[model samples]
Target: SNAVNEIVVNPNATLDWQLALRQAAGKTDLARDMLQMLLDFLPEVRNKVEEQLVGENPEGLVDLIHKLHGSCGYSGVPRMKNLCQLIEQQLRSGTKEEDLEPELLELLDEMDNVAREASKILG
Candidate 1:
């Protein structure tokens, strides 16, 4: 909710540039590179999900989302982090397939935004 409200005022608030740089300076110093690779690999997730998660059990899907969430923590994609958090919570409780595809597809869209901005940050 707060995230959504702030994004209303700042179009690029989805990725916090300050926090992103701090994460790199404060951590192993790979946030930008990690984000670049994250962008590259995110496309594969859609295919993987369609093949394994759309109608099937989500044990594997949860693992992948959880991993992405962890990456999001240091990568400054708070929007993606929050969405993944919600999806991870929903899946762990065992939700319906009907409710999942939309959320998963939403993540793909968020990835698109991240790629758009992450490039500028990297440069």
Candidate 2:
């Protein structure tokens, strides 16, 4: 009954390959390009997010989360979008550092997993 331990992959966690592929006009090269871009950027963005957290830069963290949240929407990564939203919400509420650390760490973990899963599916 532990929700945290559940191995849940959001049905929409990654891009909707069908819609994405079609948007590419069914061109393999274009499809790969789109997926490749997300793969290339996710880690970089994730790193910036973690850095902001470690540096205790609230404004930077807020900006990064907002950026990532929108990117996730375009990239069709629902899980990351949710994670970003959660982080942004907590940050906006001025949550205490100790309380926020767990959420920040959770965000990083989700980012790592999402990037890995995206690589597997797209690469």
Candidate 3:
């Protein structure tokens, strides 16, 4: 559910590893550089996200979504970031009468996949 969970990782996120590695090929520096950026921003982003997840504070959620969108874009995790954006929009407009928990849970699954994929590739 996009409403209950703020982010979910995609199982297919590892598919990106093939693409990213091929795109970089022998040039590990490109991947490393990208990893560095993720490292720099991901911690704060994760912390903020965790905080909002507990409180469900709209403002905190908005702040998290904004940062996640930008950072994910920078790290090439656009889908994960986009989901965050959608969650933010949902918060702004309000969750539907039903499907709130399912929505958030779905996003949470996607984010889990994405985060794992990112960690694997960046490592």
**Per-prediction TM-score:** 0.75, 0.66, 0.54
**Candidate 2 clashing pairs, residues 3+ apart or interchain:** none
- Per-residue alpha-carbon lDDT of candidate 1 for residues 46-121, written as tens digits (9 for 90 to 100): 5666665446654567788888888877667778888788888997888765576667766776777787887677
State model 2's lDDT.
Answer: 0.64
Instruction: Give the worst 10-residue stretch by lDDT in candidate 1.
Output: 1-10
lDDT of 2 by residue, 41-84 (tens): 76766677667657755456578678777766545556667777
Q: Taking the tens digit of each residue's C-alpha lDDT, what string does model 3 give over 1-123?
A: 133443325544423544444555546677556646655665565555555456544445567667666655544555566666776677678775133445444445555566566667645
How much RMSD separates candidate 3 from the native structure? 5.2
Candidates sorted by TM-score, descending order? 1, 2, 3
For each candidate, what is the lDDT? 0.71, 0.64, 0.55
- Per-residue error for 46 in candidate 2, Å, reads 2.6
How many times do residue backbones clash in model 2? Answer: 0
Backbone N/Cα/C clashes per model: 0, 0, 25
| Best model per TM-score | 1
Distance (Å) between predicted and true CA of 94, model 2? Answer: 2.7
Candidate 3, run of 10 with poorest lDDT = 1-10
Rank list by lDDT: 1, 2, 3
